[PDB]
């Protein structure tokens, strides 16, 4: 993600976009980047356009290490 | 820890500023300077994010009063609309002298006026430290 | 410390009076880890989604920043956009962030600019931290209120929050809702009501008619 | 093809990416990513397995949002044995109890034994002690010396018994309490002629061979009583000795069968020492076509599972803090996946120990397979497993862009 | 409600206060000897007195958990 | 550490000495810590190892193939019908063949939002009013023409500076 | 605890010195840590607690063998310790 003006130079957060059209946030820790296989340079995008895609759950190692008996349908 | 709760009956009584007990100065005010090799003709890097050159098109914020609660501010020819509000550390102060060299940076970072060929107020009546 | 917290009833009443009865907008710094008694707070725990801001784990209380219902607390980021993980106190009250490095300002005791202050020794020390980031947000709030004089304090805060650029978790105690964005705050058509979650996420599948 | 396997798009509607195993389903001219095999089968209506296709092919077709039921089963292997066996078992700590459910034939080798005949065990629940024997439970009291003394129990031995789990308490059916049998209208006059005494009096007659025969006067006659039962009546104040009578007059007297003695045993109870057998199980057994299931009780030093397979017991999360759910599940040899219960209801049990309800209609019984006849199982055991959503065709025809998050997970430890 | 307990709940203990960091001398001048070494000689002398006293009280076990490094 | 049933297609992950069924590939990679792909294993072998409950993040992505084209191109599109609009987001290079054209020079378009009329030209939006005949006439507009302009989506209103 | 105890030639025996617990001064309950110079909550550990454990064991031993002299009680503790 980067600013919308034509002269912006920042880079504030990393996102993954699936071909089904949903964005998932990626925690930029060295362990998360290497486990997913995202040790690569990201392409820039404008927030005014990217915000229009629906947001899913965050991807992180500490987040996936959980057990569930059954999952709540709703 | 639980989120705070509020009781509006406890409002403190209004009155002129003053310390709760007599106090005295214990140390000399800190000195200030410039780092080797700096050049103030280039814009500060933090201004690249704010894009102020496009935001000022709707006006520079005329007529808004901002209160700075801190170590006070020292007058300067670049701050033409500074107002003294009072002092709680020293009983006789106006709240207009920055011994810690902190209030002047916070304040000047908000309202300092850009450079011009001549200053609006050439006088300099400020007292010594 | 979270232990032996001091009675703040007087401060609580003063904040409510200024925010509600006088419609003032209060901007406060998140605090710097270099201060004598500030210690780093713990962040979100995926194993206990009971409270997304993790209030039960707080260890250091920062006041008046604590009154998150009436005060806007600013965290700090470097000039590139990365959070200053080493000095912001990252509590559950943090709501927004702004730059806090390469500070420049007018000089007291002189008639020119300065960049550093003398330390306790020969060392010349450069200033940095949230105390400057709070000043930046205070400037943007002044411009917005000058353009939308009809809005109340609670509405101006929602205009700044909803226009900021978010972090990877959407809300994070390290930077709050995101990074401030002046041009967006002054021109976007932000909805006037507070945030609300959707009613339901599912929809029926329109299966084609089977062939004869 | 053998050197570098791959695949081609075909008529089959369920396909999977050979490079990543992602599962897709086609509807119309569009591919939809599916959450699991169960919903993919149920949406298309064909009971089948995914067809592998190369990634470069799937990328050309148009997509759509996610479809299916979240968390549904992901593998199907119908299995139905001729004999069905289920056990609800627990184990006591060296305070606290742990409940384990077993599907399949138990192992009774070693010191394990059936709790039949004169063997019995005492447990505590709800403030009352309970005696378990012959597949039933009965209540007892610590103050009733008249019953304890001839039965062989002791007040210390009754008040110090270990706790019992609520799961086992419901599984075991209750029987009449171990108390002094009351006689209606005791002391009243007998209705039959020649009555040796009033109602509630005990009569005894000797024999040329064997032990003496005891009997009790009732409003309508006399009921014969076993020796152990007679001692309870004899032990309580009362007459010094029973009425001795001639065999011939007693033979002519009207015999009655009105009071029930089902709770009293034949000899003093052989109380099993809980320190040596810290585990007791309830066992339900039935053979296809039998009129009724067989109920038995087992006890031993450890759960009736083989020492070799003791390591592959499944441990559940058990988010429910109430007693209505088990802690562990084990699938022994010849277990049953597809089950029906006593108007009947159909259930599918996964290897992970979750149960899912299946519709009775041909739609579900065709799309998912499962067309064979299910095996029988008892509701008192099956209900102990955690429940998932029902697999109806109306439920799978749903789209999603984000799934709801679970509010009570548990930690995974490496 | 609480699992803690002492090693010997039946003993009887005598308490003597011989050292503490919260107290100081109210005439800091000490003359010829350096104020830091002057304090150690005071501790050695006071320590000997406490041991003799504790013995005459009849104690059979004396525990000293405060020692001086030199 | 990541294996899949060769017949059933089910996905499993190994931790310690147990096999856990995983919800998706994204969570399987994070748990194991390796950027691998599922290995195909004979179903008869999977049945011999001990199970565990479900693990992972529900609904996470199921396939990873990073990409980095030479340039980044994004579009936010608004299409009106005949009242009502739809918003479309395009990622990649747009197709300019045919009757389509890039707005430049004297070309302009008028849209409505919040009742006000906005003129889009030179890559920006500027406000105008229907009462001011003195400005409308020299520019070539007409009060009727401005009043009849069609709606504008919030997505496009926030995007145009 | 190689980093925290002085290894002199007089050292004769050893005992635990971590995970200390005890009654609380100025209160009626248990404690685990003490307020340091800063607001930090400092946890106690070290030989001053190990000397307490041995003081308890010595009290029990010369309760059972009241005939032995001081020098003999020390030899009874030393000879039964598990050696390095």
Short mmCIF file of C-alpha atoms in Angstrom, two decimals, chain C residues 183 187-191, chain F residues 113 125 154 157-159:
data_model
loop_
_atom_site.label_atom_id
_atom_site.label_comp_id
_atom_site.label_asym_id
_atom_site.label_seq_id
_atom_site.Cartn_x
_atom_site.Cartn_y
_atom_site.Cartn_z
CA UNK C 183 -5.80 15.34 1.54
CA UNK C 187 -12.17 15.86 0.55
CA UNK C 188 -13.62 12.35 0.93
CA UNK C 189 -17.35 11.72 1.49
CA UNK C 190 -16.92 9.84 4.79
CA UNK C 191 -20.22 8.43 6.16
CA UNK F 113 -23.22 14.02 -6.63
CA UNK F 125 -13.18 17.47 -10.84
CA UNK F 154 -18.89 7.28 -4.18
CA UNK F 157 -16.00 10.69 -6.16
CA UNK F 158 -13.32 9.85 -3.58
CA UNK F 159 -10.82 8.86 -6.30
#
